[PDB]
From a paper:
[name], and this interaction targets [name] to centrioles. allows homo-multimerisation, the interaction with the [name] domain of [name], or both. structures and interactions of CCDs and [name]-PB3s in humans and flies. [name]/Ana2, which can then interact with and recruit Sas-6.
Numbering used by the authors: 658 to 744
Write the structure that this text describes.
């Protein structure tokens, strides 16, 4: 969807805020985490380097390496808020 903020997160990857509130992080290994706003159903969509996508909702426990990676998203959300104007 339309990026409204995008920042490089050194040592982690590239983070994007999409126009409808989803936050995505593309990690250095090609994995992607999408954090879905609670208003849109919440949860996490995680795509492995091999292309496999999994949705983790409320009540799903997060396996390795998803749990630790999702644990980094709050700090990245704050970085996106203070991100420069895109461009």
């Amino acid at each position: 969807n339309i990026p409204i903020k995008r920042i490089n997160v050194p040592e982690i990857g590239i983070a994007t805020e999409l126009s409808h509130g989803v936050v995505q992080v593309q990690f250095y290994d090609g994995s992607v985490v999408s954090v879905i706003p609670s208003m849109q159903g919440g949860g996490i969509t995680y795509t492995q380097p091999n292309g496999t996508s999994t949705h983790f909702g409320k009540g799903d426990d997060l396996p390795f390496p998803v749990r630790d990676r999702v644990g980094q998203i709050p700090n990245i959300q704050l970085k996106l808020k203070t991100a420069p104007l895109l461009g």
